Swiss-Prot record:
One of its GO terms (cellular component) is plasma membrane. Residues 61-66, 118-127, 178-195, 253-262, 316-328 are cytoplasmic. It comes from the Eukaryota. It is linked to Myasthenic syndrome, congenital, 21, presynaptic: A form of congenital myasthenic syndrome, a group of disorders characterized by failure of neuromuscular transmission, including pre-synaptic, synaptic, and post-synaptic disorders that are not of autoimmune origin. Clinical features are easy fatigability and muscle weakness. CMS21 is an autosomal recessive, pre-synaptic form characterized by ptosis, ophthalmoplegia, fatigable weakness, apneic crises, and deterioration of symptoms in cold water. Learning difficulties and left ventricular dysfunction may be present in some patients. Optimum pH is 7. Changing residue 215 to Q: Has normal transporter activity. Loss of activity. Peripheral and central cholinergic nervous systems. The chain crosses the membrane at residues 5-25, 40-60, 67-87, 97-117, 128-148, 157-177, 196-216, 232-252, 263-283, 295-315, 329-349, 354-374. This is Vesicular acetylcholine transporter. The keyword Glycoprotein applies. It catalyses: acetylcholine(out) + 2 H(+)(in) = acetylcholine(in) + 2 H(+)(out); choline(in) + 2 H(+)(out) = choline(out) + 2 H(+)(in); serotonin(in) + 2 H(+)(out) = serotonin(out) + 2 H(+)(in). It comes from Homo sapiens (Human). The chain holds residues 30 to 476 of 532 of the full protein. Interacts with SEC14L1. Potently inhibited by L-vesamicol, reserpine and tetrabenazine.
Length: 382
């Protein structure tokens, strides 16, 4: 028990958190439906994640990661009960913005708590891997079932049930950890100018471009002239979970036998992601495409559970020992591709076609692994 009971509560608060940013995409254009106006609504979540994260950086490391987590959970509960009482454009826009703010306040605090409660070499990696696996189980296998549940019942009862469950989890966390009972960190604008952190931030912002750009342009490529039914459009990302957990487990296991090596895994993951992005075109069948998607999803875990604890290690070694405003920088890095995707992907696909942007993403991905080589002396720093 002890610290382990908190980890389960935080992890579940992230599984249901990622369920909602991706169960509303197929629901939006059943009400409003000239296509540029609907693009901004889908980009509202990531836009607010860039204008609140720098302001919420120093906020997190000032009151021990509890009040920000509770604030984020409350805001997201408020935003969940608003998606089910909405039919017009403005209400959905406001709900999406509130969801983005709640994510920006909650995910960083949860990751910081997980990193703080497990200070050690062989346990922090395991905790972060568990958190990432719980995130992936909510982000990659849930929306297929949520779509069927909405098609059967609707959008009122399930969303209210989700809000009730989120409130239950928040109340459980409040009862377990009591914040209302009787170290100056490094600011972001000076933490950014670190040669050993900018590379990691760039790798994080580069390893997430293919996921942000494949959606929502993969459906119009599946249905267009290649034998696409309706099941194999929502069931094309579900068999993409086993490689992810396998990669997370493999990287966590290999991070213990070899302690020094924490850049080779990132380079290999980036290479795999680039190769998968390059090979995703030119597959005139469902099975090769789903295999390429499997490889693409597997490559991301290698980068994630090899460059996520590296930030904590660096901020502990050559800075002050507070775990905040660093995962905020990581979140800023991660929330740029998702902001740039649903607005530029359609234009790029219409102009150059779904055969050159994929190679461009692959070439960009295979141009940073050499850059990730300036992380060879980490662990020797004194």
């Amino acid at each position: 028990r002890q610290r382990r009971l908190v980890l389960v509560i935080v992890c579940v608060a992230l599984l249901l958190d990622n369920m909602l940013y991706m169960v509303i995409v197929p629901i939006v254009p059943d009400y409003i439906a000239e296509d540029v106006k609907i693009g901004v609504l889908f980009a509202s979540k990531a836009i607010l994640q860039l204008l609140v994260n720098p302001l919420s950086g120093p906020f997190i490391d000032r009151m021990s990661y509890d009040v920000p987590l509770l604030i984020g959970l409350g805001v997201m509960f408020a935003s969940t009960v608003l998606f089910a009482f909405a039919e017009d454009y403005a209400t959905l826009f406001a709900a999406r913005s509130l969801q983005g703010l709640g994510s920006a306040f909650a995910d960083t605090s949860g990751i910081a708590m997980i990193a703080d409660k497990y200070p050690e070499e062989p346990e922090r990696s395991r905790a972060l891997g568990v958190a990432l696996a719980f995130i992936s189980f909510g982000s990659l296998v849930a929306p297929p079932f949520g779509g069927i549940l909405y098609e059967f019942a609707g959008k009122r009862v399930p969303f209210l049930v989700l809000a009730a469950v989120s409130l239950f989890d928040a109340l459980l966390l409040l009862a377990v950890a009591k914040p209302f009972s009787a170290p100056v960190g490094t600011p972001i604008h000076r933490l950014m100018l670190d040669p050993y952190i900018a590379v990691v931030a760039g790798a994080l912002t580069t390893c997430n471009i293919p996921l942000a750009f494949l959606e929502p342009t993969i459906a119009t490529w599946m249905k267009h002239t290649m034998a696409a039914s309706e099941w194999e459009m929502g069931m094309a990302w579900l068999p993409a979970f086993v490689p992810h957990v396998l990669g997370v487990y493999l990287t966590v296991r290999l991070a213990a036998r070899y302690p020094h090596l924490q850049w080779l895994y990132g380079a290999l993951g980036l290479a795999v992601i680039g190769a998968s992005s390059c090979i995703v075109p030119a597959c005139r069948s469902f099975a090769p495409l789903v295999v390429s998607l499997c490889g693409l999803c597997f490559g991301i875990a290698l980068v994630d559970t090899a460059l996520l604890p590296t930030l904590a290690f660096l901020v502990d070694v050559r800075h002050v020992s507070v775990y905040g405003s660093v995962y905020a920088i990581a979140d800023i890095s991660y929330s740029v591709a998702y902001a740039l995707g649903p607005i530029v992907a359609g234009h790029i696909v219409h102009s150059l076609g779904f055969e050159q942007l994929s190679l461009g993403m692959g070439l960009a991905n295979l141009l940073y692994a050499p850059v990730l080589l300036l992380l060879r002396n980490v662990g020797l720093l004194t």
